[PDB]
């Protein structure tokens, strides 16, 4: 099953082959060695992080 973890910020972003965003996630409590690329549909109510990254 999936595990929800708390996000600290978004570090970078890219497109998948289907034109949807994927986001490089800094996880709360962890450093840059644990960053993972996550598709947008993994994210729950993360619009503010996305706006903060695009804003910035």
């Amino acid at each position: 099953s999936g595990d929800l973890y708390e996000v600290e910020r978004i570090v970078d972003k890219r497109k998948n082959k289907k034109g949807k965003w994927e986001y490089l996630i800094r996880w709360k409590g962890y450093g840059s060695t644990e960053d993972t690329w996550e598709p947008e549909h993994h994210l729950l109510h993360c619009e503010e992080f996305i706006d903060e990254f695009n804003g910035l």
Binding site: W37, L43, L44
Partner: peptide, 5 residues
């Protein structure tokens, strides 16, 4: 929160 792969 977000799912972690």
């Amino acid at each position: 929160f977000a799912l972690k792969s």
